[PDB]
Amino acid sequence: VESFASMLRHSPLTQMGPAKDKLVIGRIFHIVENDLYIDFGGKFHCVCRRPEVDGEKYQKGTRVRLRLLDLELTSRFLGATTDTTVLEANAVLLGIQ
Amino acid sequence: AKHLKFIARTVMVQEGNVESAYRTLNRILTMDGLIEDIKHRRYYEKPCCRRQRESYERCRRIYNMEMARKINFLMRKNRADPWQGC
Amino acid sequence: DPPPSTLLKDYQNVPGIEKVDDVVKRLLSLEMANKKEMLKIKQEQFMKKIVANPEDTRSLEARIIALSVKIRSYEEHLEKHRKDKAHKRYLLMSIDQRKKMLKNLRN
Amino acid sequence: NEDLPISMENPYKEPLKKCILCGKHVDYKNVQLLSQFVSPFTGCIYGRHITGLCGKKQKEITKAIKRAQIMGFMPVTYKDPAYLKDPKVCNIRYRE
Amino acid sequence: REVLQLQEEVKNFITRENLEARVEAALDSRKNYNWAITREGLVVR
Amino acid sequence: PRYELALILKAMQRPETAATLKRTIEALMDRGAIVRDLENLGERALPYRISAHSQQHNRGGYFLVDFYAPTAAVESMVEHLSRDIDVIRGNIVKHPLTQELKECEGIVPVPLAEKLYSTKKR
Amino acid sequence: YHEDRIRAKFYSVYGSGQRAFDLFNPNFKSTCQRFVEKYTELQKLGETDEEKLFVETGKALLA
Amino acid sequence: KFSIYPPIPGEESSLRWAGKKFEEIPIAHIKASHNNTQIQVVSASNEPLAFASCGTEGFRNAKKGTGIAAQTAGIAAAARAKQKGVIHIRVVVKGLGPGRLSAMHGLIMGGLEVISITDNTPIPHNGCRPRKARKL
Amino acid sequence: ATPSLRGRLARFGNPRKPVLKPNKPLILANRVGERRREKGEATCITEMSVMMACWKQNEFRDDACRKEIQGFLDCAARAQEARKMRSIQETLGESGSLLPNKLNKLLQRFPNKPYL
Amino acid sequence: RFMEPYIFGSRLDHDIIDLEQTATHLQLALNFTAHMAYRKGIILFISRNRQFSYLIENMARDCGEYAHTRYFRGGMLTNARLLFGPTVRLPDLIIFLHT
RNA sequence: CCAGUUGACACAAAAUAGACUACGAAAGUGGCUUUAACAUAUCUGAACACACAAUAGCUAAGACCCAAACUGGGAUUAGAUACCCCACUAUGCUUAGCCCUAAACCUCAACAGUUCAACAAAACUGCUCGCCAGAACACUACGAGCCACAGCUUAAAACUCAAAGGAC
């Protein structure tokens, strides 16, 4: 049990601040049937499919750069007084290394 | 019988493509509501009924916009299962 | 019955229109405004003639003078274009408020 | 003290979200400029959200447009072919 | 300052140096702001 | 508020229009109307005429007479304008160039509906 | 946090976050994170002007 | 490419489409409705020549408003116009009904080339008030 | 996006005039519009009409309307095929987009949480 | 509503919970679960989100507890006398892994 | 005078923007120039008075191509002052002698505030006047007020009963 203030201050999710146009690198947390849900900390992980340019290096423990765009994805529809979450992020993929 | 009618709602046709100009005119009538204008001015509708119909049209437009937004927002999941464990 | 042609109440401390031609002063005198100018004239005159602390429009006596000026303005407005019932009801409510304020004062 | 969450002055503030009239008052004495916001066939104006303006903004804009149409500062029935193309000010809903 | 600005602008209205000539120019000459605009603040005809 | 006149007439000779404009300016200066600028929108003319009632205006000019009236003279000015002959659609205007639209900065986000029906099922 | 203004200035004056961030292991470090840490170390104790040190660090990292 | 606005002969014609100005291209006034049509093909010199109906074929009931009678009348008018020379025309439409697109297709198939649909439908811009509701 | 409806509400708050008067329960759902077809179509009859016209202009048999007779045959065939293709694609199983039930399930994946 | 006391703050539509409260809750819950397993306390796991059902089931296998990461049919705990035996000790502790 | 390109006579009617936000105690409104435009900002305090008219109507009339109350002639018609086709008379725009009733509903009063019989416009208390605690008779006979003389504010008492009403 160390200092609670410093630990709450210096943290990855808090150090990255408001994720917006930030190239983040990470690995895949779980192989998908035919997708490519690559993780990278933050609050959620991106969602996409395997790219045509080099789509084999993606392994459980790799390092591929992302873009991080909208880590919330929510919108009050019609009468839903609350929000409708999707647990996604959706970001433009760059490549490998 | 008042002004030059060759310029009022006179869409040009290119290469005899009357279908394109006709489709543009129909889209104009629909969006702007000129067909609706004719249908509503041809005969009378109670001002109470008119306001109720306007409110119903606003409600229908809101419903259609929300449906389109929900479709465009949830079409992102058109992929596959994430885990497939339970 | 305040005077018709006078000087501006707000533009009183401006010597840049006193020693000038006619149109320059007219642009900043009683000509381009409306009945509000006559209302301000009446307010200033009655405040200088009655209360010892003019230019206020907030205190008790100032509020009463403002209400009286508003009633006079509504009367003068109804003097012309009598085909307006909304303004008639406005004047009726103004007279009711005048009665209420006078009663509260006397009591 | 400093390592605790303290509400600051709320950074990441975008400037005045201006729509199109950032600082250029459109003139109501022209053909091309006044017809840009009007259809060159029936004299119709585009929606409020289509132009991206606010409430009072687009309200006064369309009021001035109708004033120009009526008083005689712009042709309402149509537009002269002299002023051909029009910049993409209001997202045209037809033809495209 | 506003009164001084108005006094200075009064000379820019219809001074005696441009009375009949001004009417002649208005009846013959041109002086319009015929300029189109786009989504942004750009000048174009 | 301020005023603004846009005298729309035809291209009828020239000395007659000049004399009429001179007379109008002299009358406005002698009465109590301050004239701002006497600009002009060229020889522009709408491609379509007017549904007149009681004339036929094809080609005409746009002689502006940016003037400012006090209060008890708008009717007299309208009468003096109607006293003319060739007029498309005489209609005084209120100077909108100086002060733009009302006080409004930019766009604001539209609020969402918060609880419009009872929480049950329906 | 106090680093909000620092990040805002860093991303407004210069480009957005272009460095690859891991964010898996705790208190990870890279280049932009190292710059933020250096800024926090140089803050406060400035008073005069922090833009000077900001531009100095930016030019040292870029050239 | 190709301006959408029609250059009227006054303000302003500048090209010669197949050696024919805008005024040289006559009009094709048609009364499009659910009942019948009154075609009118003008000449190059601004003179009417053609005029076909629907009941003349043999029908007299609501069958005249169908597309068959409209197309036949359009073909007859196109033939009457070509008898003296017209070729180009300006399609017109007045009202709504099955004879709207059918008349245009008939005019197109009658050998006449269309270049500008100068349709002038009856759109009373805030004029005649509405009448009592009736089953249309 | 949506029209103004803050003050214009028939509630105890703002005593303004209500604008939106929804006769139906304005509550989102997870079901696409109703499926429908066949009511007052009577389409694809121009070929048959021109064939009948050509036959009436001549006599009864096919002598100068071979083009019209083959057009009528092709029109009947294509009309049957088009009715079938409509009832299939335009109603239920499509080929290019998603199906009605598929879209309904996709919307149901994330319904709503109105009870907070 | 009852989650506001725990939710300390937020980071742009992202709630943050105090670490001390979560640590104390974890300590208490783990102590209770351990002292319950000290008497064969049948612990029951639940996780229908499919996020980590595999790992939860593997951990339950490695230990002596059980999991209910599948559909809840006609009463699995309130009506466990028909679908199962009559004398069956029901779970005395349920650790909702993903409620 | 049917389809109009070169034009034509109404106290009409607000084509998309009207998807906009307002005042008025509430009626009430949207294509334009001008006169005058938003009362007190502590609340309430007359259904024995000053005024509005929602829409309509009696009397004196002006008056808009454009609408119907009186309408004729014909699908259907067994029996149709409506339905399916033409327009028209009191009236829609204007000044006066007038009942001011409504679904003048947003059936939810103004201020101080705080956090579910069922249908649901969420719950909890103070302040001011109004309401009733048998229906049909009883938006009525009769009485009081109105220049209404078919009505308006109030508007009761007899024989019948287990009531009656609303929701689920």
Ligand SMILES: [Mg+2]
């Ligand atoms: Mg309903």
Ligand SMILES: [Mg+2]
């Ligand atoms: Mg009270």
Ligand SMILES: [Mg+2]
């Ligand atoms: Mg009282």
Ligand SMILES: [Mg+2]
């Ligand atoms: Mg009334």
Ligand SMILES: [Mg+2]
């Ligand atoms: Mg009538």
Ligand SMILES: [Mg+2]
């Ligand atoms: Mg009549």
Ligand SMILES: [Mg+2]
């Ligand atoms: Mg009117």
Ligand SMILES: [Mg+2]
């Ligand atoms: Mg009453």
Ligand SMILES: [Mg+2]
């Ligand atoms: Mg009512």
Ligand SMILES: [Zn+2]
């Ligand atoms: Zn703007």
